[PDB]
Design a protein around this nucleic acid. Structure first.
Ligand code: MG
Ligand code: MG
Lengths: 288, 104, 288, 102, 286, 288
DNA sequence: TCTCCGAG
DNA sequence: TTCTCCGAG
DNA sequence: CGTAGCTGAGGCCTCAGCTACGTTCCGTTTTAGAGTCATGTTGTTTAGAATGGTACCAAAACCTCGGAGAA
DNA sequence: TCGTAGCTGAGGCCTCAGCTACGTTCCGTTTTGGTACCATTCTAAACAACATGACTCTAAAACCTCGGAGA
């Protein structure tokens, strides 16, 4: 497919040649075939690149990410035309029933909380894990009594202590935030390629933001981030960053197959959309 | 699971026609992301036999149909064993297997 | 926010300095305060730009658009923190009534046939022109008896002889095809700037056509192409090519104003969309 | 049930001294029963890692200490599967593993 | 060690270069590294070769064989100096007691007749095989009894019928004889390299034949020949010829090891000689 | 059988025609009927021959002998069907009595010392010569009190100075060593033609010396070498080399006949062997 | 009038 | 002048 | 007949540096065929070490003592 | 401060055919240490070779409405 995650943080010019990304720094120089690449992170603000490069970077499924003066992701590239037949899949998205949207969205959120408990069980909180499975059991379509929220609170208060918020500006929240951004970008990409709008979320249309549908889809994968970051909870933020990249390096038990992560999200996303078009019943499941 | 294709050639330069079909062939290779290891001897990194089996086809399609050209598949683990009796190994990321990369 | 729509199609380096976007071409050079800017269109594949610029471009939540070798939109930047007003424009596009769509498309197609007639009159077919205006007069919403098609055939058969078809491999059809593709590109560009999805046409609705809505919009302009091509109908294809570029060089009577073409399509497009969202009536008209 | 060693080289031609050490090397190789399989790319047949392990030493011993020179071991079974994109097989008995010969 | 068996039957010139045997035919050409080579057969009488080649052929333990107008083996090369220290091993050979010589020779002939029965057992003569193991059980040093002959008679009469004892000139005997020649030559070579005279047989010193000791040593191996030739008993001689080369190609369980044949004979012969010098008791078996 | 001993030491091709061995050198050419031939010695490594020839050489059971780069026997051809007289000669050699071996060896060593003195006398050492003849007179079988060794020491010390040793790296020792090896080769060759094994010396008996018997036989001739080498004792080694070849060019008083050297060694060796088998008494004598 | 071809 | 110790075989 | 070592002709193989080139639909849906790609599963290689050795070659050891050099 | 294809010629690699100069340097024996050798079997671990069950594209023909140049 493409496997590399290429990260740039040196004053440099990026270009295209013969199917290769071209990296020039002053002394050093590298070429890398695009077929191999899965992600381009531009960390720094001292980087030059060509429009042609971008075209070709888009032509391949390559996720490009852009960064702040402080090396934080501020944005991504969003291609319009993820298929030969973008239009076909858009009309189906619009034909998506309110009721189905609910069933599916709620199925996903179920997975979110299952994975949240399993993470708690992994850190020796035998009882809070169980307490979360209760919250799960006792919910209905579009989580009207915000049980997703009640699980999430005891999740973060058990992990990082009863005085932690998730609103406070610390090295932990930065870490999860960075982590979370990453995951959203994956699903953003896979959605487009599938032929969908990311703005039109299952619960919220693009009321507040343009990546609602991806934010809805990624929910079951957050605990992956939470694991890493917890394991490095007391490390300084830049350490947390490098540790997160694990997500791409690693494999996870998805469907009786140990698969890489982007490849998971491809199949996962597709089989979700298939349900929303009502091409199938069942929903993909993901379990940490 | 990673795999490495190795291509070696000895291609006649005698005629205009001979050379043309040469240059075409080296470009093809460059365009397919092949690394030059020694003059007339290039390596392509792969990821699966299915990637391999594909890349095979591509070569059959752009066969120059001159000279001697030869293809040998091995594994990254095996390719990693290869001993440099003199001179140094190429640092190029192209030649690496790192899933992560850092331009610094 | 800002008001300017900045369009680049010269081999150039873009940079940032002192809150100004910095444009360097070989000879020419320009600085532009970012606060002024509302949109950045990158037309060509010969453009270089810095990651600092992009940071600052995203800070202002300016809309950045990217284009392929043929000057078509392929993608845009998507920030995680923030949006550009164009984002909203989508939900409006979806709220487009079946009825409005009809009125507006049919108005357009009326202009198409008026301009087809006016062209035939120009070449001394006093009567075929008139015969086309008859077809026009008989238009029902979404042209159910296919008046468009019947005018179009008699148009081509009269211009280029009753022998001629559109599917046959000539210097002529090549000429038109090249011509047609150009126009489409203009409208594709101007659309996404408004924040519309080109995939979702008014009548066009073709799966494999990513640019239905633009193909709908361009319809009244084709005859501009047809004029040049007919005037050079004899000439070898490459001659036709160079002569078509006239379209950008020239000016045309649009709104009592002699205007350049891309500026026409800008105002034209905008004021069409506005009607579809029902923010005004008075569709724009374009007469050759 | 053999091995096959494979040697690739890229050796500097600029000086008198540079070329001398070259020839030496090629001779060494010819004398050690190596088949030239392409220009600058030679194959030695072996039967034993023990044979291999030895031949390695010999090479370490006559290292020209110039150029880029590369050693790759594979198996006969692997070598056999090598595909000839074009041009005919190296049918010399020298390049075979048949233990009977004509 | 060396592994190839190189066979020449085309009008040609053989030479040496850079550790390679050099083969020039009128149009075809071949170089072969000597270290790879285990045997040279010269089939035809249209072959040229250099003295240097021969030197170097001798330098490597390579067995060279020479052939008739009719492509039969008439002779081989015999080197004098098979070691750095030829002399040391020769003086020991001379100190060989009459007694030991007997024990060891008779242990070998024993192996001959076991293999003879095991070959008969293999061709479903479950009973002639048992009948040969009886002749083995009873005999004494240097076969006064001529039991070697009695087992051998019933061996050939059981295999190829009661009306053949192998004296007649047919495709079968030609086949065995060619086969037998081959094995002898192996041992002949290995003996010299160990540092022995081949003329000084355990029974007969060089009364007539200069290859006595090798003929004594090979005896347990003949049945290998007999297998092939029996299996091709009904084939025309030239077919029998190519089929025999199997001996080199193939492997045989020797000492818990599956081993090639010449490498077997190397260890076999050495450990035999070690006993005759009374450096060890036990004898190798097959 | 046959009577000729044919010896080849010229770059040449050997062939078979019409029952004749065919000898081609560049200039010279010779045919020889095979029935005449008893032995073929191939001294050199520059000789070519046909497998036909060999067949026929075997057919006649002619003894063929093969030599290394340094003209020493390394092997012979061993037919399966047949023998050559020489084959018998081994069993006689083994039947050599301990006593005869003594007499014969000691006779030879006597000659060595005689010739040693005669050389000293030649160089005006009237007294050391005489001193050596004394040593000679007190010889017992197998020289048990080492007279040979003591004569030798005073020989070399008188010739080349009491400082000289034989093991030190000089042009002189190189000179003699080259000389000595020449002589040895001759006898080695002549021995194997009679059918003797060179490994089995009368007194020599060295593990690592494959040519004991020849080393025993050559002893009386060494002083020939010593003369030349002494006469050129001053000269650079390459000069010594050329001057030694004199040995083959020249003639020596052997049996009242002025004879060439190889021809001497032929008769000399034969008549020594003959004595050891006890086919005659009268050991040959050789006097410088 | 009748029947294709083929523009959209 | 008797002593050791070298080094040819 | 062979090694060793060198030269120069001429065939390979690159690279930096020239040249010329650069937007060709728009009625929509079905279908068929030739590209993708990523995992798990079979019986079978395979490194790499372990095991138990042989072949050669020097250096250094052993020999007897008549004589040169030490004392 | 964009990319492509394709060609040229300088000069670096790599080979071969074709020259030159060259070609026997122990013989008191045996023991001992070092450096080469060489062919086997056994071990978890690696592999190649399908099998699985997918998804992405593109062309070409299939489908539609009927004014018209015509029989
Ligand atoms: Mg090459
Ligand atoms: Mg090379």
């Amino acid at each position: 497919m493409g496997w590399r995650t290429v990260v740039v943080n040196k004053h440099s010019k990026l270009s295209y040649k013969n199917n290769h990304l071209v990296f020039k720094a002053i002394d050093h120089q590298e070429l890398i075939h695009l077929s191999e690449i899965d992600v381009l992170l531009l960390e720094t603000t001292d980087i030059s690149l060509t429009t042609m490069l971008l075209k070709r970077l888009i032509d391949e499924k390559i996720l490009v990410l852009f960064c702040d003066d402080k090396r934080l992701p501020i944005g991504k590239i969003l291609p319009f035309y993820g298929r030969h037949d973008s239009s076909l899949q858009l009309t189906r998205q619009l034909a998506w029933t309110e009721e189905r949207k609910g069933q599916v969205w709620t199925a996903i959120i179920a997975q979110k909380i299952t994975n949240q408990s399993l993470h708690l069980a992994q850190r020796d909180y035998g009882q809070k894990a169980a307490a979360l499975l209760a919250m799960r059991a006792e919910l209905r379509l579009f989580d009207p009594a915000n049980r997703e929220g009640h699980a999430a609170r005891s999740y973060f208060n058990t992990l990082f202590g009863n005085d932690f918020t998730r609103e406070q500006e610390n090295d932990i929240n930065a870490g999860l935030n960075y982590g979370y951004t990453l995951l959203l970008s994956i699903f953003a990409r896979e959605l487009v390629q599938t032929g969908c709008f990311t703005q039109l979320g299952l619960k919220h249309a693009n009321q507040f933001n343009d990546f609602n549908l991806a934010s809805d889809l990624m929910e079951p994968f957050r605990p992956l981030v939470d694991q890493i970051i917890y394991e490095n909870r007391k490390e300084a933020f830049p350490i947390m960053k490098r540790k997160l990249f694990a997500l791409f390096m690693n494999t996870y038990m998805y469907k009786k197959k140990q698969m890489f992560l982007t490849n998971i999200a491809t199949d996962y996303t597709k089989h979700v959309v298939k349900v929303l078009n009502q091409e199938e019943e069942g929903v993909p499941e993901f379990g940490i | 699971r990673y795999m490495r294709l190795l291509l070696m050639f000895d291609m006649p330069t005698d005629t205009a026609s001979d050379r043309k079909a040469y240059r075409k062939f080296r470009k093809f290779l460059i365009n397919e992301g092949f690394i030059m290891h020694q003059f007339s001897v290039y390596s392509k990194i792969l990821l699966n036999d299915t990637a391999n089996k594909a890349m095979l086809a591509r070569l059959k399609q752009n066969n120059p149909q001159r000279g001697l050209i030869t293809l040998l598949n091995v594994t990254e683990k095996q390719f990693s064993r290869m001993i440099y009796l003199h001179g140094e190994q190429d640092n190029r990321v192209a030649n690496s297997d790192e899933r992560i990369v850092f331009l610094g």
